[PDB]
Design a binder for these strands. Structure first.
Ligand SMILES: [Mg+2]
Ligand SMILES: [Mg+2]
Ligand SMILES: [Mg+2]
Ligand SMILES: [Mg+2]
Ligand SMILES: [Mg+2]
Ligand SMILES: [Mg+2]
Ligand SMILES: [Mg+2]
Ligand SMILES: [Mg+2]
Ligand SMILES: [Mg+2]
Ligand SMILES: [Mg+2]
Ligand SMILES: [Mg+2]
Ligand SMILES: [Mg+2]
Ligand SMILES: [Mg+2]
Ligand SMILES: [Mg+2]
Ligand SMILES: [Mg+2]
Ligand SMILES: [Mg+2]
Ligand SMILES: [Mg+2]
Ligand SMILES: [Mg+2]
Ligand SMILES: [Mg+2]
Ligand SMILES: [Mg+2]
Ligand SMILES: [Mg+2]
Lengths: 244, 181, 170, 57
RNA sequence: UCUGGUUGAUCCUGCCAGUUCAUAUGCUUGUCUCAAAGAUUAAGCCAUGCAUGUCUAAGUAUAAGCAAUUUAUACAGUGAAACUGCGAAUGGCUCAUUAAAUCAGUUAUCGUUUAUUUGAUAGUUCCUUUACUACAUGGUAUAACUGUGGUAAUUCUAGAGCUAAUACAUGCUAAUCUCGACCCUUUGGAAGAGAUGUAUUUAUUAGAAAUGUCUUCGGACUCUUUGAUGAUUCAUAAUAACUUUUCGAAUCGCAUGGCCUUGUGCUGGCGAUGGUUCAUUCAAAUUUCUGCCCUAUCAACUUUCGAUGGUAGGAUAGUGGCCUACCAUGGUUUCAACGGGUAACGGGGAAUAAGGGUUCGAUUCCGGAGAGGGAGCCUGAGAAACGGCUACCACAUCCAAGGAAGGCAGCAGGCGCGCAAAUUACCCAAUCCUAAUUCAGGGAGGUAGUGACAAUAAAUAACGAUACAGGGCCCA
RNA sequence: UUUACUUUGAAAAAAUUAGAGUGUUCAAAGCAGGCGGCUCGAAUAUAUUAGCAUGGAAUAAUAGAAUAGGACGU
């Protein structure tokens, strides 16, 4: 091609969206945004194919232009806005709050949360670095830049971001015995505790995870997301608690 | 373009169509069950071949094998539900003992004849295609419809049928009108 | 017509490759800017993205650094004396990176006299060769900038082993 | 299919020019303005060779 | 692959006879659902029509537009035209070229650009002509429009007169922070000593036994002071200059709250669009390893005109013989180099088979390439674009003969024969994409029509009564 | 000791293939949620080679200061 693509065939769309193959020729192409294309749920898919509040794209646009939908506390009017893992979606007229978490099947689950839990989210630290004027900052998995982080925060840790202010309230270090959630691979959606991080310099690090049933599995460190201490997650978990 | 839609053939031509034993067997089958052509027999033979080949492959596997348990139980349950396999023969060994007549006895045409709603298999076919038969609340006009164990006792004349309590058909009321005139 | 693709070249075995596709804009080159000493003539080039380069078609001044003294002064460039890639660039007085040029010594001499009060004594001591150049009136300098890329003709004064090397080569 | 016969070789003379150039470099071992400007047979002779040699004989 | 013959009767070796898919074509063709539509190695040639435009309250209306009004006093509703902005680099089609190339899996960028999206981010107080616009600068300026015109002719345009901006081009407006003597002992005051953006180019620099004393029993007394990677000349910071040199809001909607020393004073809400740098996302370019059909009656090839490598420069977004200059003489090859053929785009896949194999894959998804053939470019974040431009080759249309205009391998529809095959249909309602934008646009896409492509189910009859006759069938 | 080899684990898009559930009236198909907590529901699998992590005692290569030496001069 001579520049960026703007369409998406339904067969080429992410499988976990569960789109009917005969419905049309195209799927909603997620727009640029906080999350990657394959790892995102556009608002149209959530509002129409998961919640069924809209019967088609035109009613999704009607809902969005009324300013009824908030993503992480901010109104979004873009139909293909790429909501993703750990995103909070608020619908005030229905008194509904959702957090985007995969189920054991590997698909984003319709997980309803309370208004108290809707006030924060968790971000995996992707980068810690000094910005201009020597101000440190952290970049999280959803593209948030947060300045003046606690000096103890490192990469692969998790921070608790208050949505109203976008500031770090607490953090969890990546260490053995921490509760982790698998966000990629064939174990996508499983929950367990870190047993060992196998390190390979110049290669991909590997993490052994033990589930509550004592089954062990190995995953790349890129697919691991710390969510709390064992027996005490920082977020409400979907049905099944990431087992099997 | 839009994604492809799947399809498949439901039958296959036999290895040697011209064997005298095969022709005589087909004659007896089509006569006893009132079949239209050899393609219906081929369709049933194709299904039975798939089922028995699956059972053979599962029996080759070790007992207590997870695949054997899962797929054999599914196959046995399906065959018992459709009525071909008896409740007292819930094993793959008896799945290998099945025959085409077992499936032909489950056709709605055969059931309509056997329950006494029709005087022959051909009268049963005519009754089904003419919208006189209901399975439960549903009119079924397909003779090859496969009756389940639970569905067996719900075969009846349809509410809309002249034989099911509705008014007479065109012929009867035409004759009555001319007789009155 | 300039392209930087590697497909037109022979394989490492020596095989002649066939044309895969027509030339692409993302693999182009442009005409060199043979910068020469004279009144400042610079024209912008719109490069990939919105970015811009500066083509020094002509230049006669530059910011040259005395690294031992830790200073920089703007100075007139007299001419090109030596070039390690091609002598025709010296013959035509073409300014590129790594060219050895002669620069006016006046601003550096003035700074030295102001700072050291001399034409303290230990700190004022410099290399014999540099002081001999100051007596001559011109200093040997090496251009550290890329004139055809940034539009600047910055450089530094040759000292020590590098100065000895280039004095031999001259 | 580098040098296969084309339906209309005259209509693509520019393409044929490249092919001749490609052959030359490839087979060399065996042998051994600006448009964007503002202003712009053998048997018979052999058989004949047999007569004259015969007649001269 | 089997079956029957060749003997008085067997065995072996031979002979004889019978034993889906692809192309073309013949006849028949009622009902339901469903679905496809290539082919002269001719990527041969195309009449006609359509397939890309786009406006919110929120960039620019004295249209001599329309319509309103408490009948208008800068404007204000709605709004053609034109400017400005964005898109037109996606989509759709085709398989010509292409044999370590594309492609598949697997890597790298500590080797580079990236519109847009998302998140962060920029008080520099002062510094002589204060002879001072910031209660806000210019034409260094125009379109539409008005009017006068040329040409046979085109989405051709000339001369003249006007007038805007988020176009273009200029240019401003008593701060904050360190210590802090002295008082006072805190909710402290502050004499005073000091400090002060970005962007560009270069040079230089940093980036590594207090185990005590007192105390109110708390606490205080002296010291610490960058981070990351497996790894960096990394992030970041500092000094001195440098620059045809940047940026640091002269923009727009809705609304009319708060202080008073009552002034059209000061202050002030929710938004739109912009803007520097970083991060992110959508991408792009390059890149590591392994893997292709036939040919050895192709054994040496590459290097003169870059082939392999070194140094330096130039160019590039950037690495690199990518190019140039000067140096070496290297690089590949019987483990098949190089050359030749390919009715060679690669793959996911399809067919067959008991297994090994073998054939097919233009063809719904992904990647690549092309737009009659070579070559070159403008604009732009992005194109070596072709429903963009310029030349040359080949075809070809109009002409008043002076000129002007071309690219269906997009959707329909034609020619390529004298012998043959879907509609020049309806619509953006669904799917999604584009725009300034919920609304406009979309031959993308969908709807229906049209040779039995491949498939699914399935009618053309069912049930009775009576009369007559004596033969009907099977084997051999 | 190292390699080959072999085991296990990631990886190898979706569609297609196999398989599970589901009276599209049947079927070819398409499809993921039901009742008022119910311990209900695709449980899923599949790929020669190359690269990555990992357990191995044989086999085939590959290694050893392995079981070595101790006499003279001015
Ligand atoms: Mg394209
Ligand atoms: Mg994994
Ligand atoms: Mg009826
Ligand atoms: Mg009908
Ligand atoms: Mg606007
Ligand atoms: Mg070749
Ligand atoms: Mg945009
Ligand atoms: Mg931004
Ligand atoms: Mg640096
Ligand atoms: Mg170089
Ligand atoms: Mg050279
Ligand atoms: Mg070809
Ligand atoms: Mg394609
Ligand atoms: Mg192209
Ligand atoms: Mg053509
Ligand atoms: Mg553009
Ligand atoms: Mg072109
Ligand atoms: Mg066209
Ligand atoms: Mg195009
Ligand atoms: Mg066409
Ligand atoms: Mg179409």
């Amino acid at each position: 091609a001579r520049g960026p693509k703007k369409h998406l065939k339904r067969l080429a769309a992410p499988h976990h969206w569960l789109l009917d193959k005969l419905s049309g020729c195209y799927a909603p192409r997620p727009s640029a945004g906080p999350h990657k294309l394959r790892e995102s749920l556009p608002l149209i898919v959530f509002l129409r194919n998961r919640l069924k509040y809209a019967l088609n794209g035109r009613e999704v646009k009607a809902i969005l232009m009324q300013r009824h939908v908030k993503v992480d506390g901010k109104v979004r009017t873009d139909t293909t806005y790429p909501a993703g893992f750990m995103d909070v979606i608020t619908l005030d007229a229905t008194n509904e709050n959702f957090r985007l978490v995969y189920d054991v099947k590997g698909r984003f689950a319709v997980h309803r949360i309370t208004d108290e839990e809707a006030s924060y989210k968790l971000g995996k630290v992707k980068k810690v670095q000094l910005g201009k004027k020597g101000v440190p900052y952290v970049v999280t998995h959803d593209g948030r830049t947060i300045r003046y982080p606690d000096p103890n925060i490192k990469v692969n840790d998790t921070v608790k971001i208050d949505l109203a202010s976008g500031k770090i309230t607490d953090f969890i270090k990546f260490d053995a015995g921490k509760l982790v959630y698998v966000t990629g691979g064939r174990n996508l959606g499983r929950i367990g505790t870190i047993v060992h991080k196998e390190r390979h310099d110049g290669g991909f690090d590997l993490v052994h995870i033990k589930d509550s049933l004592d089954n062990t599995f190995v995953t790349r460190l890129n697919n691991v997301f710390v969510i709390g201490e064992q027996g005490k997650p920082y977020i409400s978990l979907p049905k099944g608690k990431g087992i099997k | 373009p839009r994604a492809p839609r799947t399809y498949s053939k439901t039958y296959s031509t036999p290895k040697r169509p011209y064997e005298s034993s095969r022709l005589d067997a087909e004659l007896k089958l089509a006569g006893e069950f009132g079949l239209k052509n050899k393609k219906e027999i081929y369709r049933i033979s194709f299904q039975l071949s798939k089922i028995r080949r699956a059972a053979r492959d599962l029996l080759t596997r070790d007992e207590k094998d997870p695949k054997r348990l899962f797929e054999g139980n599914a196959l046995i349950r399906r065959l018992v539900r459709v009525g071909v396999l008896s409740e007292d023969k819930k094993k793959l060994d008896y799945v290998l003992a099945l025959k085409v007549e077992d499936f032909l006895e489950r056709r709605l045409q055969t059931q309509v004849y056997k329950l006494g709603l029709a005087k022959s298999v051909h009268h049963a076919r005519v009754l089904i295609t003419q919208r006189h038969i209901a399975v439960g609340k549903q009119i079924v006009n397909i003779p090859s419809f496969m009756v389940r164990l639970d569905s067996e006792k719900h075969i009846d004349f349809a509410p809309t049928s002249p034989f099911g309590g509705a008014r007479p058909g065109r012929v009867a009321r035409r004759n009555a009108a001319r007789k009155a005139e | 017509g300039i392209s930087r693709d590697s497909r037109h070249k022979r394989s490492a075995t020596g095989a002649k490759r066939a044309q895969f596709r027509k030339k692409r804009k993302f693999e182009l080159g442009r005409q060199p800017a043979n910068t020469k000493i004279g009144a400042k003539r610079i024209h912008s080039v719109r490069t990939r993205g919105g970015n811009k380069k500066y083509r020094a078609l002509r230049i006669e001044t530059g910011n040259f650094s005395w690294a031992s003294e830790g200073i920089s002064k703007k100075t007139r460039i007299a001419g090109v004396v030596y070039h390690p890639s091609n002598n025709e660039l010296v013959r035509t007085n073409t300014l590129t990176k790594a060219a050895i040029v002669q620069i006016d010594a006046t601003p550096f001499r003035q700074w030295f006299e102001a700072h050291y009060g001399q034409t303290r004594a230990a700190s004022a001591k410099i290399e014999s060769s540099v002081e001999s150049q100051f007596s001559a009136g011109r200093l040997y300098a090496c251009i550290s900038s890329r004139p055809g890329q940034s539009g600047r003709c910055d450089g530094y004064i040759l000292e020590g082993e590098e100065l000895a090397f280039y004095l031999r080569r001259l | 299919g580098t040098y296969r016969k084309r339906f209309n070789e005259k209509a693509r003379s520019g393409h044929m020019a490249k092919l001749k150039e490609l052959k030359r470099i490839r087979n060399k071992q065996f042998t051994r303005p600006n448009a964007n400007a503002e202003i712009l047979s053998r048997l018979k002779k052999k058989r004949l060779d047999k007569f004259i040699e015969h007649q001269l004989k």
